[PDB]
Structure 1
Amino acid sequence: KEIDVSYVKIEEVIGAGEFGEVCRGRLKAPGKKESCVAIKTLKGGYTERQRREFLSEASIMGQFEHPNIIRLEGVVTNSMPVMILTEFMENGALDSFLRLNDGQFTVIQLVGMLRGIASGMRYLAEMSYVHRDLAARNILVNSNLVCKVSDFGLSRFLEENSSDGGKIPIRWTAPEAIAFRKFTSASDAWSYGIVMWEVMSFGERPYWDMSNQDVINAIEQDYRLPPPPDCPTSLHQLMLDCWQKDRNARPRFPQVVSALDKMIRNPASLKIVA
């Protein structure tokens, strides 16, 4: 949806993206109430290929409609700067939000966040969309702590193209996807297990200071991240299930959501910790 630039007011720069600023603003279109939006801008100096890559995120987001997937409002392409407008997520990225609030949300709250992410992923997998960069930094959080998946793009990773979309995010990536570049919803399930660990650790870095090659070798040699402090064993076991070497043995997203719903209904089960 092309948005008339007169309908947009930019209020404040709140972040930096790959191609430009991220801003908070207001969108007011005839016949509709004013709403808060996030705005990504692309200013001058870009190639047309870069413009297409920037806008491809809008095209992809616009294919989706789900309460746990970032909603596209529209784009501005007939003037400069070029913009993508979405719903505004007041609390920003989950990893940083959790680090700010370390130890300050309950296990049930954390499970609800994880449930929202899992529902978003359930939807994407149903749509045959493989995310490929599922990480807490790509989850956005609103004022009511609802978590939504962000970061959409279909460009191959650098390792998939010419000998001579960025690099594969090794710490989040399933071993077969690193080895063979076969990205599937089952490799996203591996990534989702890593997100679980990030959330239950209030935004710690997966594998601490281990090098990328150290991580690859460790996983091949059966190492898996340990339960975060105070993490319910049932949640850690779901992580381990997501991290099965055999992709076909990992839970699919409907099963992940089911498991989390059961936990929420049976909160006593979350009391067992190592």
Structure 2
Amino acid sequence: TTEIHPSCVTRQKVIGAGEFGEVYKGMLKKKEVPVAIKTLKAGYTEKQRVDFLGEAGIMGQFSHHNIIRLEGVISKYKPMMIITEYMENGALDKFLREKDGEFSVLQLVGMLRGIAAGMKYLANMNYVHRDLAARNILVNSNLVCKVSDFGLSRVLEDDPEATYTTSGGKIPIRWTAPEAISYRKFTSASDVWSFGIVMWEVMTYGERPYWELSNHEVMKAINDGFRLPTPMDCPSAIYQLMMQCWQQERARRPKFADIVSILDKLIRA
């Protein structure tokens, strides 16, 4: 994992903030390159500093067009920084809502193909995402979609003195396959279930899955056999692909390799 020299980075503008810390737009110096810069909140524990840097090391392993690129880290000075390629259009779910109705079906299917190609790469690396959702897909100015994991599932509001703490990150119920909710059996096939949910987010221009249902209401519906309905102006072939992703038996779900091929074929026809 590349350590970046602080003289090569300038922070220009905060573009997001929370209890993790902040995200900035900045430049990385060759002509300079725009970057996102994620910082660590002041007062982190040694566990948080190690985890923060450990996540950057995980991201640095990947090298794919449809996976957010890590330029490097600043770990030797404060504030510590994770420095990534900049994605002009931000998160996909927000982007689609801002662009409601403004894309052709072919363009939306192209976004899904890019996400699937990133996931196929992750699957071939034996990496299970566990939080595949449009909020974790980033969009650049050319509308290229790239897989990321900011780590929202691993922010914990546990009291530092609590008797009971969350172990192993929280799970996004509306995005998670049934065998992963029940038995914590997370695999690429449970990611494929999540991909089907992303397909529905995309074809609805960012509707919240099951929005009228509580989390328990969602798990009951799925267990009763309910599946998200066909969005208006969703082609039949795309909805069939969604339904295959949502097969109760994980062995019957397509592989990300298959999804990429299926989407490629539709795009050429």
TM-score range (shorter-chain normalised) is over 0.9
Q: Partner residue of 1:48? A: 46
- 1:251 matched residue in structure 2: 254
Aligned to 1:204: 207
Q: Are 1:188 and 2:186 counterparts? A: no
Distance in 2, Cα, partners of 1:15 & 1:200: 26
TM-score by length of 2: 0.93
Mapped to 2, the partners of 1:127 and 1:20 lie a distance apart of: 30
2:235 to 224, 232, 243: 232
Shift of 1:229: 1.4
Classify the secondary structure of the residue corresponding to 1:37. Answer: strand
Taking the aligned partners of 2:128 and 2:6, their CA distance within structure 1 comes to 33
Report the counterpart of residue 139 of structure 2 in structure 1: 141
1:157 Cα deviation from its structure 2 partner: 10
Partner of 2:76: 78
Q: 5 Å matches for 1:206-225?
A: 206-225=209-228
Q: Does 1:19 align with 2:20?
A: yes
- Aligned counterparts of 1:214 and 1:224: Cα–Cα separation in 2: 13
Distance 1:164 1:102 in 2: 38
Relative to 1, partners in 2 of residues 1:119 and 1:164: Cα closer, same or farther, differing over 3 Å?
Answer: closer
Separation in 2, partners of 1:38, 1:75? 11
Q: 3-state DSSP class of the match of 1:79? A: coil
1:50 deviates by 1.0
C-alpha RMSD of the superposition: 1.8
Paired letter, 1:145: L
**In 2, distance between residues paired with 1:193 and 1:252?**
12
Deviations 1:28-61 (A, max 9, x none): 1xxx331111000114211111111222221111
Kindly state the Cα deviation for residue 152 of structure 1 after the two structures are TM-superposed: 6.4
TM-score for the superposition, normalised by structure 1: 0.91
Instruction: Give the 3-state SS of the residue equivalent to 1:26 in structure 2.
Output: strand
Query: Which residue identity is paired with 1:213?
Result: H
Instruction: Map 1:119-198 onto structure 2 (within 5 A).
Output: 119-151=117-149, 166-198=169-201
C-alpha separation in 1, matches of 2:211 and 2:18: 24
Q: Deviations over 1:47-105 (max 9, x none)?
A: 11111122222111101000000000000011110000010000000000000000001
CA contact (8 A) 1:17 1:40 kept: no
User: How far 1:16 sits from its partner (Å)?
Assistant: 2.4
Q: What amino acid does structure 2 have at the position aligned with 1:113? A: M
Q: CA separation in 2, counterparts of 1:144 and 1:164?
A: 39
Aligned length: 260
For the residues of structure 2 that align with 1:82 and 1:14, how far apart are their CA atoms?
A: 17
CA distance in 2, matches of 1:23, 1:93: 15
Report if aligned partners of 2:19, 2:41 keep a CA contact under 8 Å in 1: no
- SS at 1:13 equivalent: strand
Alignment partners' CA distance in 1, 2:154 and 2:216? 21
Report SS of the residue matched to 1:9. strand
Distance 1:77 1:107, change over 3 A: same
Cα contact 2:91–2:138 (8 A) shared by 1: yes
1:18 CA displacement: 5.2
Deviation at 1:15, TM superposition (A): 1.3
For residue 57 of structure 1, what is the amino acid of its counterpart?
E
- Residue 112 of structure 1 aligns with an amino acid whose one-letter code is G
Which blocks of at least 5 consecutive residues in structure 2 are unaligned? 157-163
- Once the two structures are superposed, what CA deviation does each residue of 1:233-270 show, in whole Å capped at 9, x if it has no partner? 1111100000000000000000000110011011xxxx
